Write a protein that holds these residues in place. Structure first.
Motif, short mmCIF file in Angstrom:
data_model
loop_
_atom_site.label_atom_id
_atom_site.label_comp_id
_atom_site.label_asym_id
_atom_site.label_seq_id
_atom_site.Cartn_x
_atom_site.Cartn_y
_atom_site.Cartn_z
N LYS A 62 0.83 -1.20 0.00
CA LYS A 62 0.00 0.00 0.00
C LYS A 62 0.87 1.25 0.00
O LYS A 62 0.61 2.20 -0.75
N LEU A 63 1.90 1.26 0.84
CA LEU A 63 2.81 2.40 0.88
C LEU A 63 3.52 2.55 -0.45
O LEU A 63 3.75 3.67 -0.92
N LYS A 64 3.85 1.42 -1.07
CA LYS A 64 4.48 1.44 -2.38
C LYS A 64 3.52 1.96 -3.43
O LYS A 64 3.91 2.63 -4.38
N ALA A 65 2.24 1.67 -3.22
CA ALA A 65 1.21 2.13 -4.14
C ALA A 65 1.09 3.64 -4.07
O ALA A 65 1.02 4.31 -5.10
N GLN A 66 1.10 4.18 -2.85
CA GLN A 66 1.05 5.63 -2.69
C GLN A 66 2.31 6.28 -3.25
O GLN A 66 2.25 7.36 -3.85
N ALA A 67 3.44 5.62 -3.07
CA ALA A 67 4.71 6.18 -3.51
C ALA A 67 4.72 6.30 -5.02
O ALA A 67 5.01 7.36 -5.56
N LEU A 68 4.36 5.21 -5.69
CA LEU A 68 4.30 5.22 -7.14
C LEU A 68 3.24 6.20 -7.61
O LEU A 68 3.39 6.84 -8.65
N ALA A 69 2.18 6.35 -6.82
CA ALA A 69 1.08 7.23 -7.17
C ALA A 69 1.54 8.68 -7.24
O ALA A 69 1.54 9.29 -8.31
N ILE A 70 1.96 9.23 -6.10
CA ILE A 70 2.39 10.62 -6.05
C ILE A 70 3.63 10.86 -6.93
O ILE A 70 3.76 11.91 -7.54
N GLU A 71 4.50 9.86 -7.02
CA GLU A 71 5.69 10.03 -7.84
C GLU A 71 5.34 10.17 -9.32
O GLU A 71 5.74 11.14 -9.97
N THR A 72 4.56 9.22 -9.84
CA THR A 72 4.21 9.27 -11.25
C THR A 72 3.31 10.47 -11.53
O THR A 72 3.30 10.99 -12.64
N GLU A 73 2.58 10.91 -10.51
CA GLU A 73 1.68 12.05 -10.69
C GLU A 73 2.48 13.34 -10.83
O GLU A 73 2.24 14.12 -11.75
N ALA A 74 3.42 13.57 -9.92
CA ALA A 74 4.25 14.77 -9.98
C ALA A 74 5.15 14.76 -11.21
O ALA A 74 5.42 15.80 -11.81
N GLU A 75 5.60 13.57 -11.58
CA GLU A 75 6.43 13.40 -12.76
C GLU A 75 5.62 13.66 -14.03
O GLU A 75 6.14 14.12 -15.06
N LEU A 76 4.32 13.37 -13.94
CA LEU A 76 3.42 13.55 -15.07
C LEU A 76 3.29 15.02 -15.46
O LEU A 76 3.13 15.35 -16.63
N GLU A 77 3.37 15.91 -14.47
CA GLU A 77 3.34 17.34 -14.76
C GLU A 77 4.58 17.74 -15.55
O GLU A 77 4.52 18.60 -16.43
N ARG A 78 5.69 17.08 -15.24
CA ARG A 78 6.95 17.39 -15.89
C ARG A 78 6.92 16.94 -17.34
O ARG A 78 7.23 17.72 -18.24
N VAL A 79 6.51 15.69 -17.57
CA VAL A 79 6.45 15.22 -18.94
C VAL A 79 5.38 15.95 -19.73
O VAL A 79 5.50 16.13 -20.94
N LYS A 80 4.33 16.40 -19.05
CA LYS A 80 3.28 17.15 -19.73
C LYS A 80 3.81 18.49 -20.20
O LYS A 80 3.64 18.86 -21.36
#
Lengths: 49, 49
Positions: free
Chosen positions: A31-49
């Protein structure tokens, strides 16, 4: 009979009793890994966007 | 989210691609038409004659 079967039973029961604990811990860590990947890929998504 | 953002992104880059390709196709066709009309439409038939 009671001694040997009791010993093997206590031993395997200890095994499963541990395995359920590392299993549930694997769940919470999943679950913690799920949140980690979540916020990480989300913040990274702004960058790639 | 990543397949979606990549989808709209690729859609943009691709519509841009077919757009620019359409533009170069336009300037190419227009230039070729201006040249072939500059030369004389029947003259090339004489060249192939």
């Amino acid at each position: 009979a009671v001694e040997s079967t009791g010993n093997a039973k206590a031993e395997a029961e200890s095994r499963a009793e541990a395995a359920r604990i590392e299993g549930e811990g694997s769940v919470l860590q999943a679950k913690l890994k799920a949140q980690a990947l979540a916020i990480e890929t989300e913040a990274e998504l702004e960058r790639v966007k | 989210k990543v397949r979606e953002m990549e989808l709209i992104y690729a859609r943009a880059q691709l519509e841009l691609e077919v757009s620019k390709a359409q533009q170069l196709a336009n300037v190419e066709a227009k230039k070729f038409k201006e040249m072939t009309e500059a030369l004389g439409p029947g003259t090339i038939r004489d060249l192939a004659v």
